[PDB]
């Protein structure tokens, strides 16, 4: 997007993630697995929602409309009756075409942004325990089982427990 | 016999959308007639699958 997570340093998206929009994949000692992140999913959907509702509270409840099809060739008044509609309809298209195209480029860049957000929530958890591989991947430098990384997923990770280990794996 | 706020000469349409392309004549709380017949809004992220 403008943030270059989605279709950026995040090589490509995940078709095997059916319970969520953004989420986690680990490999470790015990095995390997995947979970969705529910807040950042809900985050994104909750905007795209309101956005939609906003795009739609309009439908021209006005008001004695005028004749627009014709039985005769009449000249002057008829001409203006057509110019007036032909014009309106041109504008109201432009209006529509602009609307989707803005709405859409935003709707895209916004969800890209959320994937950044999750990524910065996670780096800041792993203060000096991890490093950014560069492809939306963290190398932790400490032994971390399926209960450990569950902490990370649910935001309950303490970084000082593991610090001493991780540091020594990294710098030594 | 049915319920529908918007009537055109072609016949009743739904005003759940914002924009109709059916007929430029209306009567009722009718979407705004436009030239296009399809304008799609994103309801999701950019889709980037494998090969």
């Amino acid at each position, epitope marked *: 997007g403008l943030f270059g997570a989605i279709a950026g340093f995040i090589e490509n998206g995940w078709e095997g993630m059916i*319970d*969520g929009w953004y989420g986690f994949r680990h490999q470790n000692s015990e095995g390997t697995g995947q979970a969705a992140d529910l807040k950042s999913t*809900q985050a994104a*959907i*909750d905007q795209i929602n309101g956005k939609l*509702n906003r795009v739609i509270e309009k439908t021209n409840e006005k008001f004695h409309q005028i004749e627009k099809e014709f039985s005769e060739v009449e000249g002057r008044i008829q001409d203006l009756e057509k110019y007036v509609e032909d014009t309106k309809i041109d504008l109201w298209s432009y209006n529509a075409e602009l609307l989707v195209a803005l709405e859409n480029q935003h709707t895209i860049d916004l969800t890209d942004s959320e994937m950044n957000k999750l990524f910065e929530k996670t780096r800041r958890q792993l203060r000096e325990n991890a490093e950014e591989m560069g492809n939306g991947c963290f190398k932790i430098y400490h032994k971390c089982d399926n209960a450990c990384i569950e902490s990370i997923r649910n935001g309950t990770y303490d970084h000082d427990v593991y610090r001493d280990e991780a540091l020594n794996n990294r710098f030594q | 016999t049915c*319920i529908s706020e918007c009537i055109t000469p072609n016949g009743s349409i*739904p005003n*759940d959308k914002p924009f109709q392309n059916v007929n430029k004549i209306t009567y009722g709380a009718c979407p705004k007639y436009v030239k296009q017949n399809t304008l799609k809004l994103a*309801t999701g992220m950019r889709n980037v699958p494998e090969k």
Partner: antibody
Amino acid sequence: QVQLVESGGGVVQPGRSLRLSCAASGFTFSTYAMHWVRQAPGKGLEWVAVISYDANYKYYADSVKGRFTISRDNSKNTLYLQMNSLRAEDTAVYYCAKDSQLRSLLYFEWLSQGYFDYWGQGTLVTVSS
Amino acid sequence: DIVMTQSPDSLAVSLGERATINCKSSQSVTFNYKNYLAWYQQKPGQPPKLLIYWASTRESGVPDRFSGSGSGTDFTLTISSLQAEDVAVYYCQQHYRTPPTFGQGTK
């Protein structure tokens, strides 16, 4: 303002069926996700299921999941529920509520619903022979 | 699933005096500055009408004296003083996650 007159519920014996109904006047019905909500008398109040305004998203509470089939029509502004193979602790009255949230996009099983705004008149059901 | 208390269980107050119920959940119910939590009244044999919503807002068109508060998981109703038209069943309920999870029944 809002009305939600229901229909079509009585007794039917075990392992059987009936389709319920729910009229809706006084609000643009085809833009609001819809529910079914039940109680067994005296004991705890319980959630059945839901059906997005879309008509293309439906989710259930495990106690009836795999037996039931919820749906809706939008030219005739009404909501049903299709019941197939009724079990023991089912005996209860049913109630069609209105979701508060506007065009809630129910993209997944678990997403935040909105609070139950208004409530239908009623319908009587008892799995009994 | 997710779990809702109403502790203590049943109310036993007199006519013209304050009081308080207490609703507690398992997972937190605050997200993006909004507290997803709504109650209800059920005059036995009438389908429920709406009391509080989103934590602390009044109902569609409810009595002046009720109040509601709390954040996170530790919510608290507060009726001003028990009136004549106040003799019904009650619950608390969340809508942060499907399935929306109900309570048991406050007389």
